[PDB]
Amino acid sequence: DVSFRLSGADPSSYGMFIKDLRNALPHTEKVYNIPLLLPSVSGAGRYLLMHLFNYDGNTITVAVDVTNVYIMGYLALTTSYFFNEPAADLASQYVFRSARRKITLPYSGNYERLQIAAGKPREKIPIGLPALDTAISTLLHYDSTAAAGALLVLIQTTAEAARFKYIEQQIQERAYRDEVPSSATISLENSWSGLSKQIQLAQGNNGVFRTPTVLVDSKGNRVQITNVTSNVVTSNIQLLLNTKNI
Template identity: 35%
Template sequence: MTLVYCIHSFRKHREVIFHTIFFSQLFLLFVSLFALNMILSFSTKNATPETYRDFIQALRDQLTAGRPTSHGIPVLPRREDVPDAQRFLLVDLTNSQGNTIRLAIDVVNAYVVGYAANGRAYLLQENARDNRPPIHTLFHDATTRIDLGFDGSYSGLSRAAREAVERNTPRNRARNRAGASAHDNTPVLEQIPMGRNELDTAISLLHSASSPTNQALGFIVIIQMLSEAARFRAIEGLVRTTMRETYDPLMRGLAMESLETHWSDLSEQIQRAQQRNETGFNRTIVLHNVGNERREVNSVDSPFVRGVAMLLYDRNGNCNPASGPHRHDEL
C-alpha cells in the first residue's frame, strides 16, 4: 500500500513539475514575442533626462525580455533561435520639427541595420558576409529600398561621415569646449558631439537623406545614443546629462571608446566565467574610466561589469561556429 502511494505521489509531482516548467517557458516565450511586436518611440521635443532614461530602459526591456542571464546580466539570443519575423525591434524617433524615422535594431546584437522615412528604406551594408541578418523582412510598406554604400562598423561609418564632420567641425569647436581641443589628426568619432540637439539634428539628417555622408553622421550619433547606451549604463548616464535644456555636448573619449570596442570581449569573459562557476576572467580586459585612467578588468566583480546591461551571446564559448566580425564594436 505504501509503495503504491509513493508511486502515485511521484507521478503526480512529476506531472506538476512538468506543467510548471512547460507553462513557465510558454510564458517567457509569450513575453518575448509580445515585447518584440511593440514599436518603441522617443521624441527629442521636450525630452528630459528622465524621459531618456525611461526610453533606454524600455529598449533594454524589449531586447532582453525572457532571456537567460550570466552572472545576473541578460544574454541576447543566438541568431538561430530567433525567427526571421522576430529578428528586429522597431523604434520610432521624432525630432522637434515633427520628422520621424523608423529604426530597425537587430535583437541578436542590438545593432542598427537601417531605417525608413518618407516611404523609403535605407539599409546598411552587412559586414558579416556569411551571416547576413534577414533584412528582406523589413519595411515592406516602403516604395523604394536603398542599399547604402557603407556598413555599420565604426570604421565604415567614420569613413563615410568624414566629409560631413569636416564641414561641421568649426561650428562644433565654437559651441563645445570639449570639441575645441580637436585637431586635424583627431579621429572622426571623437569630433562628433552628442546630446539632445545633436540627436534632433541626426534625425533630420536621416529623414532628409540629402547625402550619404550626412546619413553616416546621423547613424553615428544615433547608434551611440541608443545601442551603446542600452548596452552600458555608464554610457546611458553620460548621455542622460545632455538631455537638459542647457548642457555641454558629449564627445566620445577613452571611457566610451573602451566600452564600445570591448563589449564582445566583456560578453565572452563574463559568460565563460559562469560556465566555470568562477568569477575571474581568463584574460585581462583594459578599459578606461571617465577620468581617462587605465583600468584592468579581471573579474565579474569589477564595477565596469556591473555597468553592463546586456551580453552578446558567446558563440565560441558555447561550441558554435564563429559569428564573424561584429559591427559597432569594430574600429
C-alpha cells in the first residue's frame, strides 16, 4: 500500500508519494528505460491500495489496477464505492469486502462519463493539493454529482501524476493554490495509451513511431512526436501501458 497525507503536505512530500506510487506497480521490463506495466496480474495482486488522508486526518482508501493505473473504486468509512464498469465489478470481488455496504457509482470511470456526471470538462476544474484535499473530503460522503468532480481531481493528482513527470510537476506547482490543468497536461492524459503503444512499436523500428502522436506543448502549440528522442519519451512519461491492453 501507499499513503499520502494532506496535513503538512508540501511539494517534496507529494513527490515522495508519487514516487512510492510508481514503485508499487510491478514491471519485469523496461522499454527505452521506461517501466512497462504488466499484461495482467491475477487475483488480489492486481490491486494497489492508496490510503489518502485529508487535512483533518479523515481517510479514504482507493483501489488501483496495477496493470493500467485505473482507479477501480474506494472505501470511505464502512461504505465501498465502485465504478459502473466490469473491471471494477471484478475488483470488488477482492478489495473492500469488509465494507458494510457497497454502492456502485452511476457512471464508469472514463473521463468522458465523469465529465458528463460532473457537469463540466476537466479543463474547468482546478487541480492541486488543496483540490485533492477537497476531493477526499467529498468522497467521504456519497453524493454522485459531487463525487464525479472529485474523482476527476483524484485521477489527475494520483494516476496521471504517476504516469507523467510533467503532471507531477504541475501539481507540485499547485501545492498551495489550485489551478485548472494546462492544456499540455490534458493532452498527455489523453495520449497515454497512444504514446505507450508507439514507444513499444518503436522497438523494432529504430526508435521511430509507426504513427506520430500529436500533443499540445507547454506554450499551447500543437506538436508531433515521431520518435524516442523526443523529451516526452526521454524525460516525462514514467510508465507504459502494455500493448496487450491497447
